[PDB]
Each structure stands twice: as C-alpha cells, then as structure tokens.
Predict the structure of Type IV pilin protein.
Amino acid sequence: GSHMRRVRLSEVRTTLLHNAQTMERYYRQKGTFKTYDKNKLKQNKYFNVTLSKVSPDHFTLQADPNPTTNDGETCVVTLNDGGTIAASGTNQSCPGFD
C-alpha cells in the first residue's frame, strides 16, 4: 500500500465536500444549479475537480487524478448532491473508499 495515496485520497474527499457545501448554499440562494459558474470550483494539487453532471436540482462533482503531480493514481472520485461519495480505479483499489 501507499501512505501517499491514502493521504491524497483523504484530502480530495475534503475538497469535494467543500465544493458540495458551496453548491448547497448556492442552491438555497438561487433555487437551481443551472446558473452556477463552473469556474468557481475549488481544486486540489493532485486531482482536477469538475462538474460531470449539472441539472436544475442535482449535480455530480468528479475528481480526476492529475498526472503531473499524481501519476500512477487512477482512482476517480465522485460526489453528488445527495451525499453519495464513491471512487473507482483501474485495477487499483481506492483506499478510504473501499
């Protein structure tokens, strides 16, 4: 196993949760996710965070590993507005998500 993968995967959990909280506040202010400026997502040194799905009442955030700083990591981590967090890799377990 790898201490560094465990740390980095734990940290991207936090990055995703912070982004989800920001969007939960935006929804209470605006009543939709459709107008949210995707440029405002908080990033991580080791994972690129995007909105893979956006609809009026739901979203999915996705963290894809950054190969410049995190080469060898294949786990992609997702978090939706219902609070479901999940990770899957390419023949690679995702510590903290398995």
Summary: The chain has one helix and four strands. The longest strand covers residues 47-54. The two ends are 13 Å apart (CA to CA).
